[PDB]
Amino acid sequence: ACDYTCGSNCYSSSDVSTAQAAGYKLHEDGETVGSNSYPHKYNNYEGFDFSVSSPYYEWPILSSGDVYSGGSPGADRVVFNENNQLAGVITQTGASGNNFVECT
Ligand SMILES: [Ca+2]
């Protein structure tokens, strides 16, 4: 079973914790990786109901289980906040342009 399903990508709770730990470390180090500079601020224009408060940051999560190191980020992402609390798992998959949709 999937703890989080983004389009056709299945994710376990272990996948999301491994991702978030990598992103959070980069945020503490004031560093980024990839052409689009991740992690970077996430604005919740879509009004997703997060039970953790902002500021929020996004980091790519990959379908392969590897942690993101540069190269193609895919469409999925973890969103965490300033206290290193998980907000939710989101995707561009099924969404136009600059929208996101939640992972289910
Ligand atoms: Ca996995």
What DSSP string describes 53-83? PSPEEEEE--TTSPPP-SS---SEEEEEETT
Compute the distance from residue 42 Cα to the ligand 1 centre, in Å.
Answer: 24
User: Distance between CA 8 and CA 28 in Å, rounded?
Assistant: 31
Other beta carbons less than 10 A from residue 82's beta carbon: 13
DSSP run (H or E) holding 40: strand 40-42
Total domains in the chain come to 1
* Paired tokens of 94: 């099924």
| Residues near ion ligand 1 (Cβ under 5 Å) | 15, 65
User: Distance between CA 73 and CA 36 in Å, rounded?
Assistant: 9
39: cis peptide before it, omega within 30°?
A: yes
Cα torsion 32, 67, 46, 8: sign:
positive
CA distances from 29 to 36, 61, 90 (A): 17, 19, 24
Burial of residue 55 (number of CB atoms within 10 Å: 0-12, 13-18, 19+): exposed
Compute the distance from residue 64 Cα to the ligand 1 centre, in Å.
Answer: 7
Owner of token pair 């109901």: 49
Resolution in Å equals 1.7
Distance separating the N- and C-terminal Cα atoms of the chain: 12
Experimental technique for the deposited model? X-ray
| Cβ–Cβ < 8 Å for 60, 49 | no
CATH number at residue 10: 3.10.450.30
Q: In terms of residue numbers, what domain contains 47?
A: 1-104
